[PDB]
Amino acid sequence: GSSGSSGMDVRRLKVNELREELQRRGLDTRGLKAELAERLQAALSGPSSG
């Protein structure tokens, strides 16, 4: 097992990395790097409880 929480630093992902992911998710690839990071992260965030 791995202590703490997941280790997915979307921020660490350059603009190119986020652009590729966002595109694969049909998500807009506009805005600054930070914007792209939040966009992709927002989609990943699955608060779905059950």
Side-chain angles (χ1 to χ4, degrees):
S2 208
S3 78
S5 307
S6 288
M8 174 80 270
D9 306 80
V10 47
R11 287 279 275 185
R12 207 270 180 186
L13 295 175
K14 271 286 191 272
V15 304
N16 78 299
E17 292 291 80
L18 310 162
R19 204 154 150 290
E20 288 306 285
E21 291 312 79
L22 271 160
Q23 274 278 77
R24 208 165 151 279
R25 289 203 151 170
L27 297 172
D28 210 281
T29 62
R30 291 283 279 286
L32 281 156
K33 184 201 173 183
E35 283 278 89
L36 301 174
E38 297 286 307
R39 204 188 210 294
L40 166 65
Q41 201 54 23
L44 287 165
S45 208
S48 270
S49 204

